Design a protein around this ligand. Sequence first.
Ligand SMILES: [Zn+2]
Length: 27
Amino acid sequence: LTCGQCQMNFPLGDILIFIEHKRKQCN
Ligand SMILES: [Zn+2]
């Protein structure tokens, strides 16, 4: 997944990381 806030791209199977960032790291 890719998030503009963190401006980073992730390959398939790494969606878990995206959720964590948007959890408490993406405020
Ligand atoms: Zn983010």
